[PDB]
Amino acid sequence: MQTKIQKYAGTAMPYPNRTDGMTPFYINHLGRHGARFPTSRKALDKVEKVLVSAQQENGLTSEGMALLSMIRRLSRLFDGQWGKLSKLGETEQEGIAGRMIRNYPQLFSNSAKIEAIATYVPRSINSMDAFLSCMIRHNPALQVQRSEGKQYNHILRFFDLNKSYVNYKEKGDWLPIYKAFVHKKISPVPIMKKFLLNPEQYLDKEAEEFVMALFSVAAILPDTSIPLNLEDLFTLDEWHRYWQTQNLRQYMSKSSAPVGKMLPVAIAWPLLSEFIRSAQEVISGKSDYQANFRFAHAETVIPFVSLMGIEKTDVQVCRPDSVSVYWKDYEISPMAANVQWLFYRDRDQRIWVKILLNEEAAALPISTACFPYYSWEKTRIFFNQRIEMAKKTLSVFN
């Protein structure tokens, strides 16, 4: 239902459009913050610098002059706004919250209790608040515990706390593979021709950096609620190629790529452990929360989803050029990406669990006679094995 052009924004794609009587007794949630502003001015500055230099040397086409003017505008509009949750992101959360309460009103009825946590990052806290405000508007009699901060780094920001992973992310063996893939997929000259006279005068490296920075600026704009669009700076095929390179970057640096040896995935086990613990506590009656919500990041969601072993999000593809066929970032971690575990009790008091990834039922590599419902016992056992495997992985890269 999403357009190809939307998809090619990858993890910058805005949350997609989501507009049997089974009623769950508990929901276990993890969501990325909603649509945000760019976090860094680096790409913008790079584009501006190249254009200003060309302008001083009379090297701009008319379209280039136009682009420069537009780039200066964005610089003004982004000023002081870096990394913030946009109006669109607030509305994404309201929609997710709203569909949840509409789908399962009994769960949030009367004096139901919910807890929410977030990282210390403002856009995640603001996302939590957009979400909680909706819940409370629908049922003010909810009891709500709201907390956030670095105390949750171990479960929400594990990607900052593992030294081996940090090193891998910064300078691991995925880097040269990514760089060569970009060199193969991205042809800067046709693009820069649009904006600059004598584009063939540019060194391949400066030309590539310019084009890559430009894609980055274009890709984030639909997340900002600013009524400006730059999708037409590039052809559909150029977007497709850009998307392939960034998709590979995400897969290799944050997911199940063989070059990563599952290190990027294994680091998420504390969050999977926490999910199981909170569900177990509700199930036993030690806790009587109706839902636990958690607000964090793409860097939280991607490895978490792979560690769960959902669908083929943990596929290990040897061939870089085959990755995009089997693993798609925009399907896993768009803006506002979320995972929900819905728990049910049947008439025989047996506990079942449904996993939703971006509000669509997800499959696990275990059997069930009633998909999309899985036996909680089987599921927990499976997840506990994933955690054990994760610890084993980390013990080798310690």
Q: Which of 201, 185, 206, 196 is nearest to 249 (CA)?
A: 185
Domain boundaries, the chain: 1-398
Burial group, residue 80, by CB count within 10 angstroms (0-12, 13-18, 19+): exposed
Q: Is the alpha carbon torsion for 293, 298, 304, 306 positive or negative?
A: positive
Ligand-binding site membership of 250 (annotated): yes
Ligand-binding site membership of 319 (annotated): no
Ligand-binding site membership of 392 (annotated): no
Q: Regarding beta strands 291-296 and 26-32, do their DSSP bridges make them parallel or antiparallel, or are they unpaired?
A: parallel
User: In sequence order, what are the residues at sequence separation of 6 or more whose Cβ sits closer than 8 angstroms to the Cβ of residue 173?
Assistant: 259
Identify the three-state secondary structure at position 376: helix
Ligand-binding site membership of 150 (annotated): no
Asked how this structure was determined, the answer is X-ray
What distance lies between CA 116 and its chain's CA centroid? 19
Identify the three-state secondary structure at position 172: coil
Question: Between the CA of residue 83 and those of 124, 224, 242, 367, 370, what are the distances in Å?
Answer: 10, 10, 22, 42, 42
Ligand-binding site membership of 26 (annotated): no
Ligand-binding site membership of 29 (annotated): no
Ligand-binding site membership of 36 (annotated): yes
Q: Which of 364, 274, 255 is nearest to 315 (CA)?
A: 255
CATH code linked to domain 1-398: 3.40.50.1240
Ligand-binding site membership of 123 (annotated): yes
Instruction: Write the DSSP symbol of residue 321.
Output: G
331 token code pair: 């399907």
Torsion of CA 306, 251, 38, 292, to 10 degrees: 0
User: In sequence order, what are the residues at sequence separation of 6 or more whose Cβ sits closer than 8 angstroms to the Cβ of residue 42?
Assistant: 213
Alpha-carbon distance of 91 to 124, in angstroms, equals: 14
Terminal-to-terminal C-alpha distance of the chain: 43
Q: Which residues pair with 114 in a beta bridge?
A: 144, 291
Which resolution, in Å, applies to this structure? 1.9
User: In sequence order, what are the residues at sequence separation of 6 or more whose Cβ sits closer than 8 angstroms to the Cβ of residue 124?
Assistant: 33, 118, 148, 295, 296, 297
Identify the three-state secondary structure at position 342: strand
Q: Which residues pair with 353 in a beta bridge?
A: 343, 374
Ligand-binding site membership of 99 (annotated): no
- Whether the upstream peptide bond of residue 264 has omega within 30° of 0, thus cis, is no
Does residue 34 contact residue 127 with C-beta atoms inside 8 Å? yes
Owner of token pair 């095929």: 237
* Alpha helix (H) residue ranges in the chain: 4-7, 42-56, 62-78, 87-103, 122-138, 153-156, 158-161, 163-171, 174-185, 188-193, 204-220, 236-254, 263-266, 269-284, 298-308, 323-326, 329-332, 376-396
Q: With b meaning 16 or more CB within 10 Å and e meaning fewer, what string describes 350-387?
A: ebbbbbbbbbeebebeeeeeeebbbbbeebbebbeebb
Ligand-binding site membership of 202 (annotated): no
Amino acid at 320: P
Residue 106: count other Cβ atoms within 10 Å of its Cβ.
Answer: 11
Ligand-binding site membership of 137 (annotated): no
